[PDB]
Amino acid sequence: VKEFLAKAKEDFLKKWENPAQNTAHLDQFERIKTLGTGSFGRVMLVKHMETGNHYAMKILDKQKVVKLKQIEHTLNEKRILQAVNFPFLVKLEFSFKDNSNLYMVMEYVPGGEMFSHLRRIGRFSEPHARFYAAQIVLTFEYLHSLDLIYRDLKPENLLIDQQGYIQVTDFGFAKRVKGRTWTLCGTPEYLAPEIILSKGYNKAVDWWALGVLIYEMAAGYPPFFADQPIQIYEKIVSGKVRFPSHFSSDLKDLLRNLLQVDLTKRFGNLKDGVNDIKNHKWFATTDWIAIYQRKVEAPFIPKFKGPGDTSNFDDYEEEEIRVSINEKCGKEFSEF
C-alpha cells in the first residue's frame, strides 16, 4: 500500500505538471447516442472510426460553463482526469476543443449507472453494498493520497462495468487541495454539515459522502431527504439519523462513525486515517487485495448484448451539435 501509493504519486505528479492537450478532432468519431445530460453539456456514446472503438465523449458548451462560472472547475476536471490512473476510475482517452466546446473522450462503461439498478432493485443486501463500498474506499485512499478531494459521490456518478465493478466518472468538482477549501459544491443529499455550514473543509467530506452512499445502497433511500434542498440541509446539520431495522449492528456502527457531525471524531479523518474504516467490523470479510485485483466474486453483473449496446441507460432527447464560425471563449480555456 504505502509503497504502492508512493510509486503512484510520482506518475500523477509528472502528469500533473505536463498535462496533455488536443489529442483528437471531432470528425474522427461517430456520434451515436446521449447517455447522460447536464447543466452545460451531454455525454455521448461515440465511435472512433479509425479503431472501431466506442467511448463516452463529454461535450461542454464553453459559453454555458462561463455563464455558470465553472471555468476553474472544468479546468480541474480535465487536468486531474488525464493525470490519475486506478482500476476504479474511468480512463480519459482524449481531449480537444473547437470554436464552440470542450471534449473529453472517456471509456464507455457498458453496465449503466449504479443509480439505475438500485432504483429498480430497491435496496442492496449488505454483502452487495460492501462489495461496492470497498471499491470506493480504496479509490478515496488513492485520490486523497494525491491531495485530491472528489466531492460528488452519489449513485448517479458510479457506473458498473462488464465485470460488475465500479467506475467513478464525473470529476467536475475534483480538486487538488492541501489545506481547507470553501466552494459550496456537490449534491444536496450528500453534503457534509461543514460544507453547508460554510466553514471551510478538507477530505473529511468524502468520508461523510461515503457514509451516505452505503446508507442509500443498503436501505434503498438517503439518510436525509425532503422535497426541497433547504429541508435536506436542515436535516444534515441536525445530526439525527434513524436506521432501518434491517441494518446489522456492525453496519449501524460503521455508519454512526462515518456520519459524524463532529469531524474530530469522524472515521477517515482520525489519527489512523483510512485504516479505521478498512479495519471496521463490517469490513472484516473484505479482501482488499483481492478487490484491488478484481479477483473477487462480483455479486451482480449487468450483462449487455455487444459493443455499442446502450440498454442500461435511459433515453434522452437528442440535441444537435452546433460549432460556431467564431472561436468562443479562447482565453478562458487556453490551457484546455
Binding site: 460528488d152 467536475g172 459544491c185 433511500y221 422535497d227
Partner: peptide
Amino acid sequence: TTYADFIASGRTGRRNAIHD
C-alpha cells in the same frame, strides 16, 4: 414507512449538482 415516504417524494430521480 420511510420507503413509502421516499417514493412519494420529489427527489427519487437523478439528483442534480448544486453549482451557484
